[PDB]
Design a protein around this nucleic acid. Structure first.
Lengths: 94, 94
DNA sequence: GGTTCTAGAACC
DNA sequence: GGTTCTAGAACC
């Protein structure tokens, strides 16, 4: 899955650690500081700089938001998207 | 309509001119610089600091986005929401 | 009603 | 398929 690969690789990079990273556990990820993520990182990895479209893709492939870390921190979770479970990436789709 | 009133009054204020204002015509409005609008102005007038919820309300009361001004500029339009047509505000609902 | 999360539909 | 606009549903 193209999206999941790009998502994982985005999280594989410590350059972004401050604004996008894995949750301490490693079973969810956090996006925080929408200024720099939306305007700088989204367009690096994707074809837009629009957070709502990033969110849509996450719901499209069966991520859910978690109901923190920073102030404007968004946390999403898929049961099969984890820091160590790197093989399960084509095992996530819709 | 509570939303429309608050929307109009938000646009009635030149403090915000740089980040939220009427379109030159006066028949649509522009929101631009999501940093300052979302984090500073949304919470002044509404019960959140979440742009997507602002967008939802606009679609709920029959505003549409226009397909510019700045870079991350969002423009919305209702036929009956205009700078001079201030009386038509309860004539907008859903 | 307003806010939040998720999804439909349509265009690219 | 991905992106964009709009809307459904549910909780507050």
């Amino acid at each position: 899955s193209d999206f999941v690969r790009k998502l994982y690789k985005m999280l594989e990079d410590p350059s972004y650690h401050s604004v996008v990273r894995w949750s301490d556990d490693g079973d969810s990820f956090v996006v925080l500081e929408n200024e720099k993520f939306t305007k700088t990182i989204l367009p690096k990895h994707f074809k837009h700089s629009n957070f709502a479209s990033f969110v849509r893709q996450l719901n499209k492939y069966d991520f859910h938001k978690v109901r923190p870390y920073g102030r404007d921190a968004w946390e999403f979770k898929h049961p099969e998207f984890r820091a160590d479970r790197k093989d399960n990436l084509d095992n996530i789709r819709r």
